[PDB]
Amino acid sequence: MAQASVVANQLIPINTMLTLVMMRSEVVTPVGIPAEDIPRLVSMQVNRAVPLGTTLMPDMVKGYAA
């Protein structure tokens, strides 16, 4: 399996604006937001708390569409 996802590099509190320190690239299942998209996620808000190691999904990010 080759496709990497965005995963949380720290706990991301609810309603936090994302920064680059918060986002790592990992090959995980199920697949989340493509890791390719990390620079476009900066300053977008999360609508729930995202624990460390959690795969960031499209429905967790306010305003995200692809």
Author numbering: 0 to 65
What did the study's authors say about this model?
These models typically yield better R free values and MolProbity scores compared with the PDB-deposited or Phenix-refined coordinates.
Briefly, we use the initial (unrefined) protein coordinates to construct the crystal unit cell (UC). The thus obtained UC is used as a simulation cell. The experimental SF data are automatically expanded to space group P1. Hence, the simulated UC is effectively treated as a (redefined) asymmetric unit. In this manner, structural variations can develop among all protein molecules in the simulated UC. Generally, our model can be viewed as a realistic representation of an individual unit cell, rather than the traditional ensemble-average representation of the crystal. Compared with the original structure, it shows a substantial improvement in R free (0.194 versus 0.261) as well as in the MolProbity score (96th versus 51st percentile).
